[PDB]
């Protein structure tokens, strides 16, 4: 139906070492023309807390442009009631060291409405993806 969510790895290449600037790991598009109050992304499994987890066992924090992180609630959220798509990127900060391995994210997107000074979920979707960082030519 009207609710839609698309979570994908970035369509380009990520290279190992110190990131020379903020680097997008994943894109998140979500929208609904039906009435609603906002959206949240809840990291699940080993991503709990807002992390990617690498095949080497390292946790790397992710940041959002469009959403705000609330650690109390293990979620990013944005309050938006418009019918237009929200286009966000989850990124790693400039200077972050990445290793040439696979980094995974798993989470759940929820769309919610407001009532009784709180909120109620009206739709949800599990999302996941991975980026395999390349060494680059040496």
Ligand X SMILES: NCCc1ccc(S(=O)(=O)F)cc1
Other Cβ atoms closer than 10 A to 108:
17
Which residue of the chain is nearest ligand GAL when measured via CB? Answer: 73
Cβ atoms 124, 108 nearer than 8 A: yes
Binding mask 85-104 for ligand GAL (x = CB under 6 A): --------------------
**DSSP assignment string, 96-129:** -EE-SSEEEEEEEEEEEEEETTEEEEEEEEEEEE
By CB under 6 A, tell whether 64 contacts ligand GAL.
no
Distances (CA, A) of 60 to 13, 43, 63, 100, 122: 17, 13, 10, 13, 31
By CB under 6 A, tell whether 121 contacts ligand GAL.
no
Among 5, 25, 40, 41, binds ligand GAL (CB under 6 A): 40
By CB under 5 A, tell whether 27 contacts Br ion.
yes
Number of residues that bind ligand X (CB under 6 A): 8
Residues that bind ligand X (CB under 6 A): 49-51, 61-63, 69, 71
Residues that bind ligand GAL (CB under 6 A): 38, 40, 70, 73, 75, 77, 79, 119
């Amino acid at each position: 139906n009207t609710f839609h969510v698309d979570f994908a790895p970035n369509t380009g290449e990520i290279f190992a070492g110190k990131q020379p600037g903020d680097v997008t790991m994943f894109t998140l598009t979500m929208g609904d023309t039906a009435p609603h109050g906002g959206w949240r992304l809840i990291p699940t499994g080993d991503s709990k807390g807002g992390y990617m987890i690498s095949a080497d066992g390292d946790y790397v924090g992710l940041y959002s442009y469009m959403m705000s992180w609330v650690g109390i609630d293990n979620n990013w959220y944005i309050n938006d009631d418009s019918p237009k798509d929200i286009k966000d990127h989850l990124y790693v900060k400039a200077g972050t060291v990445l290793k040439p391995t696979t980094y995974k994210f798993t989470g759940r997107v929820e769309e919610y409405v407001f009532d009784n000074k709180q909120s109620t979920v009206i739709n949800s979707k599990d999302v996941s993806g991975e980026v395999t960082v390349k060494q680059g030519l040496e």
